[PDB]
Amino acid sequence: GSDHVDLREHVIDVPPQEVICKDNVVVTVDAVVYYQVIDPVKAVYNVSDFLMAIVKLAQTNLRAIIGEMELDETLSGRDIINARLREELDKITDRWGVKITRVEIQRIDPPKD
């Protein structure tokens, strides 16, 4: 087994990215991602690469979905956005002995006048 039985999770800080929505609407998106080192023997890389990596990835992944949306459907579809990413990353983390415990989205910024 394992003496330590704490499923402590950590949050990832990812910078926003200006992407042209579906209706050609320029906006700034931003969200957070959770994770937890389930396999230390594998994540012996001081969970460093995963940090810089994740953020970098989210940018590409999100760009796919985020790239297409509706100024409104954006706030409404918060669960969908979280899921997608969570998976896209959860699949690239599983290898680094890490899994996306959860996913959260931050407030969105509408198009300026």
Side-chain angles (χ1 to χ4, degrees):
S2 207
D3 196 314
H4 275 150
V5 297
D6 304 287
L7 279 305
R8 71 186 174 185
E9 82 312 315
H10 307 309
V11 62
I12 302 150
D13 331 322
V14 50
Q17 196 210 146
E18 289 172 294
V19 192
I20 306 166
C21 268
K22 191 90 154 272
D23 206 324
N24 195 16
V25 178
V26 60
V27 294
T28 304
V29 64
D30 46 277
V32 290
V33 171
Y34 279 52
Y35 85 83
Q36 67 172 212
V37 173
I38 48 166
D39 186 305
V41 305
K42 280 178 86 158
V44 188
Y45 56 88
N46 326 134
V47 297
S48 199
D49 272 89
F50 155 103
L51 277 168
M52 64 187 73
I54 284 292
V55 178
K56 290 170 177 204
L57 296 163
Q59 300 275 339
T60 302
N61 296 306
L62 77 77
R63 179 184 83 165
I65 300 94
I66 302 309
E68 46 170 301
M69 269 213 129
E70 290 186 77
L71 169 63
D72 187 44
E73 198 80 314
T74 40
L75 73 85
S76 90
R78 194 157 271 160
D79 160 70
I80 298 154
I81 304 164
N82 270 336
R84 295 281 174 157
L85 270 286
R86 186 189 80 83
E87 331 211 312
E88 289 270 44
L89 278 311
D90 168 61
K91 63 157 74 186
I92 286 155
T93 50
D94 171 87
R95 59 206 286 94
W96 304 334
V98 45
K99 165 269 184 85
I100 304 317
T101 30
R102 61 194 80 163
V103 270
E104 285 70 26
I105 312 288
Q106 300 276 309
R107 293 161 79 201
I108 286 79
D109 320 271
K112 60 174 79 174
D113 189 75

